Amino acid sequence: MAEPLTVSPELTANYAYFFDLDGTLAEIKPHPDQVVVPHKILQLLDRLAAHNAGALALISGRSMTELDALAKPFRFPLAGVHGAERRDINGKTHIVRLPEAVVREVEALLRSTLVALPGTELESKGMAFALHYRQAPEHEAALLALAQHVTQHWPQLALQLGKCVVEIKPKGTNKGEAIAAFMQEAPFAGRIPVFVGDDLTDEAGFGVVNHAGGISVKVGVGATQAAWRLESVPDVWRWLEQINYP
Known part of the structure; x- marks a missing residue:
């Protein structure tokens, strides 16, 4: 029942962005250490965050140290280990x-x-x-x-x-609680949440984002409570590029 996502948000709209990493921003690999976020995608995420008051976070099952290595040289707000690790816009970490x-x-x-x-x-x-x-x-x-x-x-x-x-x-600990923690803090507070993910842990985030009147996006196949769906990781990449350069 999720609808195919085909429209990209305007670059300077009032959204707060939350992206899962594995299976959303990076292609699935046989081993976690072979996973890479292409540098061009990282630049697009950095530019999208910059046009939205810094309201962009990575929300993943990975540890925050692994997210920082995947996002290098960029430093984003993070939720690692499904929210058991978190780092806010001021760099304060919560474990x-x-x-x-x-x-x-x-x-x-x-x-x-x-x-x-x-x-x-x-x-x-x-x-x-x-x-x-x-x-x-x-x-x-x-x-x-x-x-x-x-x-x-x-x-x-x-x-x-x-x-x-x-x-x-x-x-x-769950990704809905992680997104909740961000959405009461600047710069995410007051913006409309958008969350893109691909796995069962992301369904918790889809639920709170749907309840929030935000935009929930499932990547790949499978039943979901997300309202919208992208077919694959390269479709996320193209969606992100269309936000930055329509």
């Missing part, structure tokens, strides 16, 4: 903290399963854990069940399924 005993126990628990399963990868993000299986989709059900058991045993932790990944995150 969700888990008890050290929880981080220590869960990591040791997860390690035992993932050492024995080739193709799976345990990624520790400080306040979250990501179970990757892009190279071994047959282990999805086992990783999902493990993450479900962990998130049921530790009430501080919540489940976040995604593309080729099952993530364990702090309870209450």
Whole structure:
């Protein structure tokens, strides 16, 4: 029911922009380290932010250190780890903290399963854990069940399924909450939110943006509550270029 997005906003309208990274601004790759945001796209994002009072943020499951490397040389407001890390327009960073005993126990628990399963990868993000299986989709059900058991045993932790990944995150952390935190701060406050994303974590952002009277954009295939849809990452690129140079 999402409608194909074909119109680009005017460069100097009253929008606040939120972009997911993987699968939205950058093409999907077999490995996260092979992902690149083309420099021309980064320039377009920087120019779009500059014409909108700096109201543009990257909202991603990646850590903020990884976002800064992907966005180099540009420094944007960020939400990393689905919002458990955040950096506002003034550079102030906000980090969700888990008890050290929880981080220590869960990591040791997860390690035992993932050492024995080739193709799976345990990624520790400080306040979250990501179970990757892009190279071994047959282990999805086992990783999902493990993450479900962990998130049921530790009430501080919540489940976040995604593309080729099952993530364990702090309870209450989600991309709708990240966008909410920005939308009450300058320069995002008073503007109309626009959020472009591609995965299940982005549906939380689509919901708050729809409720806000903003513009929600799904990239790629799949059911969504986004109001609008772009077919692929190059369609995001062309949309971004049309905003800057209509």
